[PDB]
């Protein structure tokens, strides 16, 4: 049985309250909703353990997504953040402005995103775990883990070296691989894993550029606020 | 970095390695999704995945990848990560959507399941690999705490294939892109590999042999083995 609060009258991102470590993947499908202007509501999850929570999301993590199907027949639901924004831009974004607009463009969108998804992504994810969950701490782990966001961040410092390559997936404009790959790639993400970010002057240029966009700016200070306002759990006024 | 003089792309080219037990379970994704649609393409043995020609085509250095002529045939385009591969083979020649999702309802859960695999079991499972297998140092706490993860994701698919009418992963009437990205990670030889009884998880070994019965991939699984042990070791297959 699901909270009294919760019903699904338009497109529900699944929260938990805003600190400095739950934010990194719930932003991702909030940047992307700010950017297309999807009419969304807040839902902040107490207990991601919650029986009624695992029915939405098997793998017990937030961000997740329910949404009306476009016929309304059905409750759609989205999860893992790559899967929430793959949901956005197939149902909302009509002119593939952030999806691509034709096979090559989605080509190499799809190239961007899916290194984020399996390399980055997962790396930074067992990185974090080993460095502060893990009961024992396994220093030759974390240094190998450490390592492998280096290269990572030399992939991408590469790319966008690359003549008129602004971001990462198109030379012209910002896309769903742009938004999954920022919060790992920015100057506040490289200190907490103990890097230098200027010696990826590239990199840090387009995490500035990312960071500059309106909706990028409205989607951080939403994430840190949510739980915090008149209501700490359940769906947002 | 000069093209090898045998890379042309005339059509799809799938780049693999030489074909062992532990270098075709990615390799193998987009190959059975090509069998299933029938697409026409060329194989390519790549001898070294550190050489700077193949790097600009995957700059993560790895197999598989993609090279194809765009639609309209006046220029090519390039796909890598094994997810990514199966993502653009569907876009390219899966008009009717069979394996990709027809509608937003089916894609929804394609992506959810999929995502799972290449966020999760995939990574998971390379980790558990390279420290079992390539890392100087044997790191016999983190190898077991990455097999733990395997059991955990097991479970998770388990629930899934014990929904009434759920025969497969994503769809409950036919298999997708999401079953083609975990069959290779989720079969009794893998699971066997990773010190597993695959028998504890009942509804997902009969549903890896449901996929294993498939042509596609009997024929996928066939050809991959071979790949560098025929006439021609490297390069452009004939």
């Given amino acids: 049985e699901r909270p009294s609060d919760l019903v699904v009258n338009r497109l529900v991102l699944f929260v938990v309250k805003?600190?400095?470590?739950?934010?990194?993947?719930?932003?991702?499908?909030?940047?992307?909703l700010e950017e297309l202007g999807v009419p969304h509501?807040?839902?902040?999850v107490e207990k991601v353990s919650a029986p009624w929570f695992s029915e939405i999301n098997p793998h017990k993590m937030v961000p997740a997504?329910?949404?009306r199907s476009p016929d309304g027949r059905d409750?759609?639901?989205?999860?893992?953040?790559?899967?929430?924004?793959?949901?956005?831009?197939?149902?909302?974004?009509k002119d593939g402005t952030f999806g691509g607009r034709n096979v090559q463009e989605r080509s190499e969108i799809n190239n961007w995103l899916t290194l984020?998804?399996?390399?980055?992504?997962?790396?930074?994810?067992?990185?974090?775990?080993?460095y502060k969950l893990h009961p024992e701490k396994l220093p030759k782990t974390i240094e190998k883990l450490r390592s492998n966001i280096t290269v990572q961040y030399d992939i991408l410092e590469r790319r966008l070296n690359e003549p008129g390559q602004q971001y990462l997936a198109l030379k012209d404009r910002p896309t769903i691989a742009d938004i999954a790959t920022l919060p790992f790639a920015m100057?506040?993400?490289?200190?907490?894993?103990?890097?230098?970010f200027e010696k990826w002057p590239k990199l840090?240029?387009?995490?500035?550029?990312?960071?500059?966009?309106?909706?990028?700016?409205r989607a951080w200070q939403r994430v840190a606020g949510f739980g915090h306002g008149e209501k700490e759990y359940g769906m947002l006024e």
């Fill in 187 to 196: 100057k506040s993400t490289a200190e907490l894993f103990g890097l230098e």
């Fill in 65 to 67: 997504i329910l949404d």
């Fill in 41 to 44: 509501d807040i839902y902040v």
């Fill in 75 to 93: 409750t759609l639901r989205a999860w893992e953040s790559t899967s929430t924004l793959m949901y956005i831009a197939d149902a909302y974004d």
């Fill in 204 to 217: 840090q240029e387009w995490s500035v550029r990312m960071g500059e966009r309106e909706a990028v700016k």
């Fill in 18 to 32: 805003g600190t400095a470590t739950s934010t990194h993947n719930t932003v991702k499908p909030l940047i992307l």
């Fill in 116 to 130: 984020h998804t399996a390399a980055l992504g997962p790396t930074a994810k067992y990185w974090l775990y080993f």
